[model samples]
Target: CPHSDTLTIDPMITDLAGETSRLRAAGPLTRIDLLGVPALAVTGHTLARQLLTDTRLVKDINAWSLWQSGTVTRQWPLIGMIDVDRSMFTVDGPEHRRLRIKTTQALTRRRLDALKPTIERYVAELLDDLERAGADGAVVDLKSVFAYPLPMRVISALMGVPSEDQEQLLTWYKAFFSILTPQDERLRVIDEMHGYFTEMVRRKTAEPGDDLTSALIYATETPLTEEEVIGNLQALVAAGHETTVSLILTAVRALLSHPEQLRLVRDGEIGWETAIEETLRWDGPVIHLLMRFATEDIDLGDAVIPRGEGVVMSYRAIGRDITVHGADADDFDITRATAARHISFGHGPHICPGAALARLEAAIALPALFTRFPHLHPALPLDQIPNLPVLTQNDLSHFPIHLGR
Candidate 1:
C-alpha cells in the first residue's frame, strides 16, 4: 500500500473495481469521490471485515430515497405497504432475526436436501438440451438454455410460482433489477410483482399445498394475513433467483477464461465447496452494495459522509484487494486452503438466510455444468459479453457457448 494523491472513482456504468484498483495502488486508504458519491477505499481483510461486521456502520440498503419513493408508489398496488423490507435480506436488528428464524425453520438443511434429486434432474435436462442443440454446429448460447433456466426452475418450485406466469415474472425481474432504467419504469415493475404475488398468495390460501408458500403459511399460525405470506413469497421469488444466476454466469466466465483452472473441476480434482468459494472471490455476482441513505453525519476516518446521501461498497474491489486476498489472490485457486471468507452474500445480522440452500444449489449445478459439457467455452469475446449493472441483483445478458462433445 503506497501513498499518493491520485484517487480514482467511477461515475459511468463500467468496471468499478478496474478504476478502484488505480486508487488503491495510489495509496493505503484513499477516500475517493464518484460524481460526489463518497466511498472509503482500503485494501486488506481488516477494512472489509470492519465495514461488514460493525453494526453501528450498519448495512444501508433501504434508507435510500429512491427505494422509499418507489415503496410509496408500489403501496397502491398493495406492495411495500406492509413489512416488505422484513423479508430475509433487507431488514436489520430483531425484526431481521425473527424473520430469518421463520425462513430458516422452513428451509432447513434437512428440508433442502429433499430438493437435491429435483435439482439434479433439472440440471441434467438443461445439459442434455444444450448438448442436443449444439450437436451439429456445436455452438449454443448456454445462458439462454442452461445457466439461466437452472436457477429459475429451482426458485419457482420452492416458491410455488406457476409455470404460466413465469414469463411475466421474468419480465418484472428484469425491469425491477435493472440499474439504468428510469424511475417510473422501475416503480411499475415493482407494482407488477406485487400484483403477481398477491394473486399467488390468494390461490395458495384457498387450497394450501406442500410447498414453500404453504410451508411459510403453516409456519405462522397466529394472526396470518394474506399480505404477510404474499410479500414474503414475492421476496423469495426475487432474491432467490438472481444472485445464484449471477454466480453461475460469473463462475462459468472465470473458468472458461482460465482453462487450466477450469480443468480442476473438469478433472474432478477438487470438490464443489472449494470451487464455490473461489468463484465468489473471483467474480462475485452481487457487484453493488444496495443504496443506503445516511441518516446522520458519520466520519468514515479519512472522510465524513453527510446524511441523506447514498453510499456503495464495491464487493468486487474488496475481494480482489491484493493486500486482503494475498499477492496472487486475483487468480482463482479452488485449493486456496482457507475458510469460506467472501462478502458475496453480504454480512452482519442481515446476511442472506437462504445462503445454505443457495450454496447447495450452486454446489450441485456448478460442478455438473463442467462435467456434463466438457468442451464448453464462451462463444463471444470477454469484452463483448453483455452484463447490466444491477444494484440489488445480477442482471447478466448472455453466455453463448460452443457445447461440443
Candidate 2:
C-alpha cells in the first residue's frame, strides 16, 4: 500500500454524505487511501460507466502491480475481497461467463415467478414475527427483525442452506463485510465460509432440490464445475443477501425521512418502482465498490491513470452526479425520470445477475410492510441511527421503529 501523498480518511461512519459530497467536488478521478491502502475513485457517472464497460480494465487483482510487488498484504482488510478465488467477481472473459451464466440462468423470469409466492410468504411470516416481537409500542430494530432476515432467509432458501445454519452464516458475513475486521478473525471467517459452502455443495449434490444450489449441481443446460459451483455460491450468498438488505434498509429510511415522498407513495401518485429507482439513484445500497485495476496506462481526455492502480467506482457520488442528475440531485424525489439511469446494479457485461430478484423482493416486501403497519414511524430520529461500518455498503445498521398500531 502506498502511504505517500494520497488523501487520508477521517472517520466516514458519521458523515458519509459529507465525504461523498467532497469526493464529487474533488474531480472525476481523484486519489485517496482506502483504509490506509492507496486507490483511485471514479467520481463522475459517465466515467464510471465508461470504465465499467471497457474491455481494457480487468477484475483480476493479480493485474495490479502493487499486489504483485507484495506491497498489499494479508493485514489489509480488503484482501478477502480481492482474493476471491475463481468466481465471476474476480475473473474476466470466458472464465467470467462460465461462473456467471449459471447464476444468470437460474434467476430467470420463470424461476423468479415460481419464487414470488415464497417471497410473499416470507414477508407475511416476518411481519407476523415483527408484530409479535414489537407488541405494545416497544421500539424494535426493523432492520434486523424485518429487513435483514427477509433477504437472508430468501437467499438461504434459494441456496438450499438449512435454517439452522443461517444465523451463523449471517454472523460470518457481517464480519466479512465489516472494514474493522481483525486479521485473524477475517482469515478464520474466510475458512469457515468456504467450508460452509463446500458442505452445502456436497449436500445438494446428494439430495438436490428445486433451489439454485441444486440447480447448479444438476443443470443439464449449463453445468458448472464443482469449484465453480462452490465459488459462485459463496459470492451469491454474500452479495445476494447483503446487497438487498442494504437497499431495503436504505429505501425504508429514505421514505420515512422524507414524509412528502412517503405521502406520494401512500396516495398512489408515485409507484413503488419509481420510488425504488429513485432510491437506487439517490441513496443507493453501495458506496464505493472496491475495485477494478487499470491494466494499462489509460488516457481519458482529462486524466491519465497509470497502469496497475486499483480504482474504486464511487457509486455514492456517481448516483448524485450533478450534470446527469440535475440541480436537485441529492433530493429524494421519486418523480425524477432520470433516476432509472443509475448504474447501481452496474453497467455493461459485469452487471449483477441477481438484480431482478432483488428488485422483486423490494417491491413485494416494502408495500406489504407499510400496509401492515399503516402508522409505522421511527422510534427515534433518523439521524440518531448508527451507520453500518462496511466501507463498500452505504446503509444504516439498525432501524428502531414503533409499530404504531
Candidate 3:
C-alpha cells in the first residue's frame, strides 16, 4: 500500500507495448514500479535470461527488503502476488525441487499426450457452438465464446473441477486476474478460492479421480499436505487456463490483423505451429511475471542492483529486444526461423510445467478454428479492441470476429 520513487507502470495504460518499449529504451535494467511496489525490471533478452538463472536472485518473497522490514504483510492486497505459500512458484532449493517433481509427474508426456483427444473434442464442440451463436455472419465475441471457454473447460476437466461449478470458477478467476478489480474484491475472491479449493481437495481425498487434483492429493511419491494440494491446484487452474486463453486469442488476433502472415499459414507456406510461436514472441501471454528478489547485489554490465531488491523479467520487451531479434523484431512474421527461441514459457528451473500442454492446446485449437471458418476476420479494428486491466496478463477482454462464412 506504500508508494515509491520508481517510475510507475500504471496498469491503466492499455498501450502496453508502447510503455514497455519506453522502458527498454531507458536501459536493459530500468527502475520501475509494478502496482505500488518498487522494483528493477530486466528489459533486455540477454539480461533477463542471465538474471533468471542467476544464483544471486531467488523466487522467495521473504528475501524482499520490505517484507523483511515488515512494511508488507500477508493482508496487503498485493500480498497474493508477492507471497504464495507452499507452492513450487514461491519456493526455492530442496522444497521447490520436491514440489516440482510431483507436478512434473502429474503432467508426464503420457498424460499430456492423453489430453490431445479431449482438447480436439472441445475444439470441435466450441467451433460448432460458435457457428450456431454467430448465424448469418453475426459478429461474435470470440474471447468469451471460443478463446476463453476452450482452455477453461479443458483445464477444468484436467483438474477434475465439477462441470456444474465451472461458471463460478471462471468468475472468480477473471476477478482475481484483473487489475481493474478492487483490492477488497480481490481479497473476497481469495477467500472464495480458498473455500472452493478446500472442498475440492477434500472431495478428491475422499474419492480420488483420474485427474491432476487427485494425482497431487494422493501422489505415491511426495504426497502433498492438504494446504500444499490446495495451493498447487489453485496455481494449476490460474496458470493452465489464463495463459492458454491469452496464447490462443493473441495468435488468432495477430494472424488476422496481419493478413500476409495469415495467408502464409493458410497457403501452407508456413505451418500453424510457427504461427503460435511467433505470437508468443511478438505478443507473449505474460507481459511480465511477478517478483524475484535479489539475494545479493548483482551487477549486469551498466546497472548495479543493490542486494535484497525485487527484479521482474519483462517478457514483452525482451521478446522485441532489437539487439537479440535484430532490427525487424517488431514485425509479426511467423516465418522467422528463430521464432521458437523466445522465452515466452520462461527459462530455467521455474519454467512453466504447463508449457507443453499450453502449446498443445494452441496448436490444436488454432488450426481447427481457421480451417472451420476459412474466411474468419475481425469484426473490429485492432486499435479499438479493449484489453483486460491486468498487470501480469497481456490479453484482450473481447475479440469480436466475423464467421465470414
Candidate 4:
C-alpha cells in the first residue's frame, strides 16, 4: 500500500471530534494525514457530491487484504459489517446491487408505514416510564431512561428476536461496537457473541419465525449458511439498534436546548418531517462516513489521491458546509425545506436501504414522545450527560431528564 506523510501512531486513538471540527472549519475540501490514515474531509456541495456519488472513489475499504493482514486485521470484524462480500452497507457494483434488491423488498415505503403505529406505541410506553420516575421536577438520565432501550426493544422485536433474549442481545450489540477498546475486551465480546448468534441462527433455521430474520431467510431462494446469516444478524443488531438509539438521544437533547426550535415541532404547526431533516443536519447520527479505500490511483480535481490508501469522509461537516447549505447553514431551523440535500442517509447508489424505515421510525417516535412529555428537560448540564469519552462507538452512559409534574 502506498503511504503519504506517515506519522507515528500507537493505535492508542487520538482526538476524533477535534480532528473533525478542524477539518469542517478548514474548507469544502481538506485532506489531513492522521499517522498513516489519510482522511479526506469534504464539505460544500461540490466536494460532498463527488465523495458520495463519484465512481472513481470506492466504498470497499476491505479491498486491500495485505494492509488488513499486516496492520488492520483486528479491525476487519467490525469492517466486515461494512464490506462488500456479505454486508449490505459496504458492498459495491453488482454484489451491492444484488443484496440491495433483496433488502429493498423488506424496507418498502408501504411496509415501513405499516410499522409506524408500533414504533409510536414503543415511544409512548417509554415516555410513560420516564414520567413515572419524575421527582420534584428533578432531572433524569434520559439516555438510560428512554433513548437507549426504546429503539433496541423495537428493532429487536422487529427482527423477530425473542423477547426473552433482548437483554442478552443488547449485550452482544455493545460488544460488537467496542472495536476501539482494548484488544482483549473486543476479542472476548466478539467470541461470546459469535457463540450466541451461532445457536440463535440454528434455532431460527429449524423453525423460522415471523420477523426480519425470517424475511431475510425467505428472501433468498437457496438457504443461507450459518455464518452469513449470523454475520448479517449481527450487523442489523449493531446498526439498527445503536444508531437510532443515539439519534433519539441527540435529537431530544438538541431540541430541548433550542426551545424556540423545540416549540416549532411541539406546536404541530411545522411539519415534523422538516424538523427531522434539520435535526439530521444539525445533530446527525453519523459523525464521519466510515473510511473508503481507493482501488486505483485517481486524481480528484487538483489533488492526486493514490490507490490502495484509506480515506474518511465527513457527513457531519458536509451537512454544515456554508457553500452547500448557504451561509446560515449551520443554524438549526425546522422550516428549511429542501429534499435530497442532506447526506444523512448518504447519497447515490450506496444510499442506505434502511433509510425509509429509520426515518419513519424517528419521525413517529420523536413526536409521540415529545408530545407526551411536554416539559421534558435534561437532568444534568449538557456536558455531563453520559456519552462515550471517545468515538469508539456512540455509547450513551445516561441522558437524565426531568419530567415536570
Candidate 5:
C-alpha cells in the first residue's frame, strides 16, 4: 500500500465518474481499501494491461496476503470474487487455460452466431412487453421491463436453467455484487448459488440438453470435472446475463443522452456496434474488477506490488484513460476511433469469453428498441434518474422513459 494513499471504495459507489477521476490522478497503481479490505487498483490503461498480462500477478487466493491470516472470510463483501474457488477466474497458466478453453468451447463465436435468431426472439418479445407496459405515452422503467429480462431469458435458455428458477438466480446475482448485503445473507446466497449450479450439473448429466451446461458436461474428448462444469456454468450464467444487461442499460442511456450519436446510428452514418463500443469505453458495465493477487513482487519501475498483496482493476477509469484516448476520453462519441480498444470486457488471458454474445445481444436490442419507439425519450433527465448503488457494476437505479404517443 502506498503511504500517501488512504482511499476506501464507497460501498454504494454512486459517483463513479468523480471517483474514477480521483483514482487516475492518484497514479497508474494506487492503494485503496475496497470495502473494508486493503487492495491496489490499476487505474491507468497501460498499467492495467501490464498488470493483467504479467506472469507475477495471479488470481490464486492462496497468493493473496490476507488469505493465510484468515482475515478475509464470508463476511467480506468481495469474498464472492476474490476467494472464488477453483474456476478459470482464480487460476493461472495451464490450469487457467484448461478451464477457460472448456468454457470458451462452450460459448464460441460460431455458437453465438447460431444463437443470434434465438437472441433476436428474446429481444423482440421483451421489447413488445415494453411497448405494452409503456402504452399511450405512459412512463416505463426500461431497466425492469426490457433491459434486465432480455439477457436473463437468453442466458437462462442457453444454460438450461428452467425459466421458473431464473428469478431465484437473479436474487443470488444481486446478493453476490451488492456490497450492502448482510454478511449472513451473502454467505447463504453464495452457498445457494453453488448448490443451484450443482443441481444444474446433475440435471444436465441425467438428461442432457442443447445448452452450455450439457456442452461443458461433454465438452470434448476432455470432459470437465464436475466442479469445473459447475464453476463455468455459474460464471457464464451470471456474467452472460448481468454484463449484457449493463451494456444495454448504459448504451441506451448514452445514446438518448447524446441524441447526435443516436441520430448518427439512426441515419446510418455509424453502426450500432460502434455505439455499443463507445458506451463500453465511456461507461463500461464494470466499475471495479476485484482481487488479482501478486504472486511475487511485481516491480513496475516507478511502482511495486509486493508479493501477497491484492489488486483490482479500476475498469471505468481505465476506459477513459487520457493517455490512450486523449483529452476527449471522457466524452462519448459513437464514431470515436479509439473506442474499441477499451478493456471494458477486460484484457489478455482472462478477457471475457462471452463478449461476442454480450455485444450481439446489445447490438440487436438497442437498435430494435429505438426502432420500435422512435419517439421514446426519458421521463426524467439522465442525472435525476439516480444510479444503482453497487460497487462492482455501473447502472441506473431505474430508467423511466416514455414510449411516446
Candidate 6:
C-alpha cells in the first residue's frame, strides 16, 4: 500500500471528530483512505454542501468506474454498504425519486404522529428496566438498556418485524454497518439480512398491515418488485434503528457532561427539543455517511475528485466546522442560535427520509429519560467511554450511568 494513498480512517480510531478536524486542516477536500479503500473526503462545510447538491455527483454504484471496471467487486467487505441495488441510498434520479416518494408516503407526519404513543410506551418500558436495574443507585449500561432498545423496537415495529425476530435483525444490521467486519462474515450477514427481509416481505404480502413494510409490498401506484421491497426494508430498518440509537445516547451523554445545559433542559428553561438539535450539531449521530460517486471529473476548490471515484461526506467535521458554525462550534452549548442549521441528517434530495421520526424519538425519549431520573449521570470517566469501532456512526457501544436518587 502506498503511504500517501492511505488516509488512515481505521475503525479503531476512538477520536473520530479529532481526526476529521486534522484532515479538514489539510484541505477542504482531502484524498485519503478508509479501510484500505482509496477515496476523497469532503472536509469543509461549503464544499460538502456543494458536492452533496451537485448533479455531477450521484449515488449510483455503477458510476464508480472501479466497480464497473472490475477493480472493486461485489465481494468487497463494504460493498453491501457502498452499492446495495434497488435501495434509495444507492440509486439516483427518477428511481431515487420513486423509491423516496413511496417510503415517504409510508412515514407521513400523520403516521409518525400516531406512533407517538408507541414511542412513549417503549420509552417508559425501557426507563422501567433502567430504574429496576439501578434501584440502589447502581450504574447501568445505558446504551444497551435504554438507548439501543428504544430505537430498535420502535423501528422494528414500524417496519412490521415480528417481535421474536428483532434481535436477529439488530445483529445482522450491526455487522452490515461495520467496516471492521471481515469480508466473509460481512457477506454472510448481508445474505442473512436479505433472506430475513425477503421472508418478511413474503409475510407482509400475505397479511398486509398498517406498517411501512406492507405499504411498500402493496403500493399500487409506485409498485416495487420483491427485491426492491426487501432492499428498501433493509435500508429503513438499519438507518432508522442505528441513527436514532446514536442520537439518543449521544444526547444523554452531552447533557450529563454539560451539567449547566442539563439543568437548562431539566428546569424547563430551554426545551428538550433545542437540546436535541444542539447535541446533533456538537456531537452528531453519524460521523461519515456512506460513499457518493462522482459521475465525471469534478473540481472542488482545493482538490479535484476524478470521475467515478468515491466521495464520503464529513458530517463530523462539518457539524463542528468553525467557518459555518462559528468560533464556539465545538462547545456543547444548547442555546446557540445556529445549532439547528447543522445537516446531520444530510442535505439535498438524498437526505435521510426518517429525519422526522428520528427527531420525534429523541424529542420524546430524551425529556422523559431526564424527567424520570432527575439525578441521572455518567458512571464512567469521559475518556473511558468507548465509541463503537465503526467508520459511519459516532456513538458509544456502552455508556454506563447512575440513575440517581
Best model number under TM-score: 5
Assess every candidate by TM-score: 0.83, 0.96, 0.95, 0.86, 0.96, 0.95
Q: Where is model 4 poorest over a 10-residue stretch in terms of lDDT?
A: 4-13
Per-residue lDDT tens digits for candidate 5, residues 140-211, read 999999998888899988888898998888878887777678878988888999998898799889999888
Model 4 ranges with Cα > 4 A deviation:
1-18, 27-29, 32-36, 43-45, 59-62, 65-69, 75-85, 135-138, 178-180, 220-225, 338-340, 383-386, 390-396
List model 3 lDDT by residue over 316-366, tens digit each. Answer: 888988887778898888887769889888887888898878888988898
In candidate 5, how many clashes are counted? 0
TM-score of 4: 0.86
Colliding pairs, model 1: none
- Per-residue lDDT of candidate 2, residues 321-401 (tens digit): 999989999888898879788988888778989989989999999999899998999998897887777777875778999
By TM-score, the better pick of 4 and 6 is 6
Candidate number achieving the greatest lDDT relative to the actual structure: 2
Clashes of each: 0, 0, 0, 9, 0, 1
Screening candidate 6 with a backbone cut-off below 3 angstroms (N, C-alpha, C), the clashing residue pairs are: 7-33
Would you list the clashing residue pairs of candidate 5?
none
Superposition error at 315 for model 2 (Å): 0.9
Error of 1 at 98 (Å): 1.6
Q: Considering TM-score, which of the candidate structures 3 and 4 is the better prediction for this target? A: 3
Q: lDDT of each model, Cα atoms only? A: 0.65, 0.85, 0.83, 0.65, 0.84, 0.82
| Candidate 4: tens digits of C-alpha lDDT, residues 1-405 | 244333221223344444444656765666655334445555445666776675666666555534655765544444433442355655567655654565577678987766777777778887777777776676677766677777777777767777788888776666555545555676677677777767777777788887777666666455554555666676676677777877777777777777888887777787767777777776677765656667777676777667766665567766776666677776776677542368876777777677777777778778877777777776677656644532424455577677764
Candidate 2 has a TM-score of 0.96
* Model 4 pairs whose backbones collide: 82-90, 84-91, 140-400, 140-401, 141-399, 141-400, 142-399, 142-400, 143-399
Cα lDDT of candidate 3 equals 0.83
